[PDB]
Amino acid sequence: LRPFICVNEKDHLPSLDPQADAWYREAVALAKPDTLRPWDRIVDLYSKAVERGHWKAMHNLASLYRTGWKDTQKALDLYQKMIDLKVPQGFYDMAAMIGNRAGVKNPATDGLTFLDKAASLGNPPALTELGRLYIYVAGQDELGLKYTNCAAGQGYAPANYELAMYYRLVAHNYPKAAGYYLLAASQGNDDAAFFMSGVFDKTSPDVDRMWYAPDEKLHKLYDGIYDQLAADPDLRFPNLIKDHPLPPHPTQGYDADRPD
Ligand SMILES: [Au+]
Ligand SMILES: [Au+]
Ligand SMILES: [Au+]
Ligand SMILES: [Au+]
Ligand SMILES: [Au+]
Ligand SMILES: [Au+]
């Protein structure tokens, strides 16, 4: 991807067939892991949707084949169908399965690795993974941050978790980092909610708190958020940030670059 150009994945997706999407949505509802799942019906619905070109159904069904409830080749075939439709997620899935470097051998990538192709089409998982490699392995912080923010901007929670970790561990901008942890947690990110559950705990060491002062109310709040989310990954917390603004940081205020 040179030069790096950030695009929105939505501008590179096939339209979804209405009947197909009805079938997909019904299968998704039936397949919720915290319910007693009717596997035959779920596979049937996904399969009907796949026959009418639904790429999200291809993705979910391929996952089911990868784990069983196992058919490696059926999963691979589905990923290839997605790639055939130039679905960005398809390139990501193929990378995540057989490896990134094999992408150069696939004609649909045009001599790009699978992740590079996916990221070129705006895929937030690929953007997040490559951004991570640029920051921590290549030492190209600014470029990796551009990748990561391109994914975060599309509402991708794990990318907000990566930004939080960067600003906490590398930049040491704790209010910024906390803003990103809270954003990821609100969007359902388990890692982020877990970290936030320790930040205002008086029994946490200073570094776990990012040197915030302990706060009983906020500890109970974020401990509760994490409790809920840990049991049910589908929860979101759309009001969390605005209903409970962050206290000022004892030395960094509301931005380490502008302590005042
Ligand atoms: Au496209
Ligand atoms: Au998935
Ligand atoms: Au540092
Ligand atoms: Au507490
Ligand atoms: Au609240
Ligand atoms: Au509050």
Automatic annotation (TrEMBL):
It comes from the Bacteria. Keywords: Signal. Residues 240-260 are annotated as: Disordered. Gene3D superfamilies: Tetratricopeptide repeat domain. Disulfide bonds join 6-150. This is Sel1 repeat family protein. It comes from Pseudomonas aeruginosa (strain ATCC 15692 / DSM 22644 / CIP 104116 / JCM 14847 / LMG 12228 / 1C / PRS 101 / PAO1).
